[PDB]
A paper describes a structure:
The ribosome is a major target for clinically used antibiotics, but multidrug resistant pathogenic bacteria are making our current arsenal of antimicrobials obsolete. Here we present cryo-electron-microscopy structures of 17 distinct compounds from six different antibiotic classes bound to the bacterial ribosome at resolutions ranging from 1.6 to 2.2 Å. The improved resolution enables a precise description of antibiotic–ribosome interactions, encompassing solvent networks that mediate multiple additional interactions between the drugs and their target. To ensure homogeneity of the antibiotic–ribosome complexes, which is important for obtaining high resolution, we used highly purified in vitro reassociated Escherichia coli 70S ribosomes, to which each cocktail of antibiotics was added.
For hygromycin B, the conformation observed in our structure does not permit coordination of a Mg2+ ion as modeled in the eukaryotic 80S-hygromycin B structure. However, density is observed for a putative K+ ion that is coordinated by rings I, II and IV of hygromycin B, 16S rRNA nucleotide G1497 and a water molecule. The K+ ion was not reported previously, and is not observed in the absence of the drug, suggesting that it is stabilized on drug binding. We also observed a putative K+ ion involved in mediating similar interactions of hygromycin B at a secondary binding site located at the junction between h22 and h23 of the 16S rRNA. The high quality of the structures enables a precise description of direct hydrogen bond interactions between the drug and the ribosome, but also indirect interactions that are mediated by resolved water molecules and ions. This latter point is exemplified by tetracycline, where we observe six-atom coordination of the primary magnesium ion (Mg1) with octahedral geometry, which was less defined in previous structures, but also by the binding of hygromycin B to the SSU, where eight atoms are involved in the coordination a putative potassium ion, which was not reported previously. The antibiotic streptomycin was included in two distinct complexes, which were collected at different cryo-EM facilities, and reconstructed and modeled independently. The resulting cryo-EM maps of streptomycin bound to the SSU body were obtained at 1.8 Å and 2.0 Å, respectively. Comparison of the two streptomycin–SSU structures revealed that, within the limits of the resolution, the binding modes, including direct and water-mediated interactions, were identical, indicating that our analyses are highly reproducible. However, the ratio between backbone and nucleobase interactions varies, ranging from 31% (four from 13) for avilamycin to 83% (10 from 12) for spectinomycin.
Numbering used by the authors:
A (entry chain K): 13 to 129
B (entry chain O): 2 to 89
C (entry chain U): 2 to 70
D (entry chain R): 21 to 74
Write the structure that this text describes.
RNA sequence: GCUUGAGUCUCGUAGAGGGGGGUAGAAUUCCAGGUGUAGCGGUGAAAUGCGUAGAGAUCUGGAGGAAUACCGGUGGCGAAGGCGGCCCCCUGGACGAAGACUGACGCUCAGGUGCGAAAGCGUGGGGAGCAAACAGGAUUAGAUACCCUGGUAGUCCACGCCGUAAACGAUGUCGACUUGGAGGUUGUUGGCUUCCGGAGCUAACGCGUUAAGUCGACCGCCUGGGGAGUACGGCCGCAAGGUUAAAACUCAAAUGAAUUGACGGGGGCCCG
RNA sequence: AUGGCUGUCGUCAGCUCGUGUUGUGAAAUGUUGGGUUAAGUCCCGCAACGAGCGC
């Protein structure tokens, strides 16, 4: 309803899944979509193409608002890193900013044990 | 470690000269001073094992120098252990 | 990696510039190494392996110049 | 190196704020260690950033 | 007696050497909400699990513990075990320079004593993350596993105990001597260190001035494979156990290195 | 027990030897290597130099 002209696409690109959330600059969510809930499960869910649709659907979630320009915040090592950003650019957003906000401990906590297969 | 001035006092007192840094008197006196100084350290810092190895070397070196001086000059030995207040 | 897209800057340039800055900071390398715990014995083992092969690359590479096939 | 000498120390950090290797900059080992200390002191005093995020 | 071994003094140098006290930033988890809405999470594929009581995501603030990205290096320091953010306090050793000084004060060391990773044990704390045990979900002929979701000791701190590890360079300590080459690190030609290689040595593999070469001193240890580093006794330990350490019996081998094949759910390159 | 004859890997590009050299030795080298061919086919390099059976 309240026309927000400027927002942030937060891309949580994990190895298994991609979550796109658009916020305002203060970080209040407008609308989200995910690869998992776009007709892609398992092998399909963890593709650039499944993240591609999640980007598209998240644009057509936030169309109530008139976001002119999206800053972009990318988080994680997944295959929805780049495919999400291109898809948002081809939803008619002006990408002013791309930022990697992938969290990196400066040491931090002991990670889980290595998988034996 | 023992300071320049604290060192130089001991060299003057136990030496034949301030240049007589080498004598067994001076060496034993300087070891005794640091051994006694470090008893304060190891009272607080009981698990400082790495430093304590250095103390035990000083103790060992002093023992060796006293045994040398005993069998060389028994008179000087007796004076030394009395002045420094050592048992043997 | 924190691109600020410039005045009249095209998208692929900024994106490829984000790609280059990400590969530079070594982000995806660091997420992968921190995914699972590597024991110090394993870390030292692979660090020695990298050291050995690197030096051993040269001894064979710098015996390749003055050798005919 | 001097932790206060910010213009110098910025020659030895990346855009992300990370200390640049000696292999890259051609710094001698002795000075890389002194440089590392100076940057870490500067980061404490908030004259340099730890990271480009913050 | 002497000064060449060994040591003392003077000046400087590098260092994750040790002990104590502070503190910083990143991240994880949790709590409190703000926004927001149907998924999240996970795998080979799943499912258990979490989620409309609003998760996941995102923003703000708070709490708490543990570890210090980059620097970082066949880099450094330490007797070995080991030691890594930054700051202070206390403290050990090493190296170099140029003298002065002591005058063989040395080397090794059974017994003895001390130190000694991780796990473990005791008492009191602490507990984010991780995780033996355990539970559930899978996989499978079965699956007391590997994989998944959780998760308690424990991992952290203080003090005490334990005294062992492929505690390894599988190479005792000290000293002398004996062609070279390329590096690293640290001093003002020395110290430490990595790789290659000569003679020599070696069963071979290899080692090669940091020797496994050539010698000397002293110590420790071995005597076929099993039985057995076990039993019994002693000593030590709160316990777990450690340490010292047999015998009968049994076999004609066990073993090391290297060679040729074959084979690999090893690699590379090709063909039908 | 055998001779002869035959299947099979497969008409796949292999399999060997003399002499020399290397190793205490089993053995190795040649036959590996760079290119190339349907081919151990050929050229080039090479402690190998030649040779046979295959091709
Ligand atoms: C060199 N100085 C050390 C002196 C010790 N007395 C400290 O206990 C130690 O600190 C501890 O370090 C370990 C790592 O070895 C953990 O990091 C602990 O968690 C710490 O430090 C804790 O706890 C502290 C608190 N206990 C308050 O002092 C602060 O929160 C610190 O930021 C936090 O890292 C310091 O580093
Ligand atoms: C007869 N005394 C010397 C005994 C040696 N075993 C010392 O290593 C040496 O010590 C060194 O002295 C020089 C000067 O000749 C510097 O001062 C070094 O810096 C020191 O001493 C260092 O390093 C020490 C560290 N090595 C830790 O103990 C401490 O930081 C001291 O405060 C600091 O003076 C003493 O002087
Ligand atoms: K700390
Ligand atoms: K010192
Ligand atoms: K003795
Ligand atoms: K726990
Ligand atoms: K011995
Ligand atoms: K026997
Ligand atoms: K041989
Ligand atoms: K031959
Ligand atoms: Mg996992
Ligand atoms: Mg210190
Ligand atoms: Mg422990
Ligand atoms: Mg305990
Ligand atoms: Mg877990
Ligand atoms: Mg598990
Ligand atoms: Mg303590
Ligand atoms: Mg043992
Ligand atoms: Mg070890
Ligand atoms: Mg080892
Ligand atoms: Mg041994
Ligand atoms: Mg060699
Ligand atoms: Mg026993
Ligand atoms: Mg016993
Ligand atoms: Mg011969
Ligand atoms: Mg052949
Ligand atoms: Mg032919
Ligand atoms: Mg040939």
């Amino acid at each position: 309803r309240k026309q927000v002209s400027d927002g942030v696409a937060h891309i949580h690109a994990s190895f298994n899944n991609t979550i796109v959330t658009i916020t305002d600059r203060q970080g209040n969510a407008l609308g989200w979509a995910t690869a998992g809930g776009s007709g892609f499960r398992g092998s399909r869910k963890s593709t650039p193409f499944a993240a591609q649709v999640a980007a598209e659907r998240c644009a057509d979630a936030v169309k109530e608002y008139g976001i002119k320009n999206l800053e972009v915040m990318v988080k994680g090592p997944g295959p929805g890193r780049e495919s999400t950003i291109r898809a948002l650019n081809a939803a008619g957003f002006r990408i002013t900013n791309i930022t990697d906000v992938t969290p990196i401990p400066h040491x931090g906590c002991r990670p889980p044990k290595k998988r034996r297969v | 470690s023992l300071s320049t001035e604290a060192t130089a006092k001991i060299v003057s007192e136990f030496g034949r000269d301030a240049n007589d840094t080498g004598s067994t008197e001076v060496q034993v006196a300087l070891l005794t001073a640091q051994i006694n100084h470090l008893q304060g350290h190891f009272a607080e810092h009981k698990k400082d094992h790495h430093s304590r190895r250095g103390l035990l070397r000083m103790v060992s070196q002093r023992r060796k120098l006293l045994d040398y001086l005993k069998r060389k000059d028994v008179a000087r030995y007796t004076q030394l252990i009395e002045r420094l207040g050592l048992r043997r | 990696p924190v691109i600020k897209v410039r005045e009249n800057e095209p998208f692929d340039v900024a994106l490829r510039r984000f790609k280059r800055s990400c590969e530079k900071a070594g982000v995806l390398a660091e997420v992968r190494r921190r995914e699972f715990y590597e024991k110090p014995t394993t870390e030292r083992k692979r660090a020695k392996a990298s050291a050995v092969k690197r030096h051993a690359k040269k001894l064979a590479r710098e015996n390749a110049r003055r050798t005919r096939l | 190196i001097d932790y206060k000498d910010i213009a110098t120390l910025k020659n030895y950090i990346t855009e992300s704020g990370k200390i640049v290797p000696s292999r890259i900059t051609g710094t001698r080992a002795k000075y890389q260690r002194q440089l590392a200390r100076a940057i870490k002191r500067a980061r404490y005093l908030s004259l340099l950033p730890y990271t480009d995020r913050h």
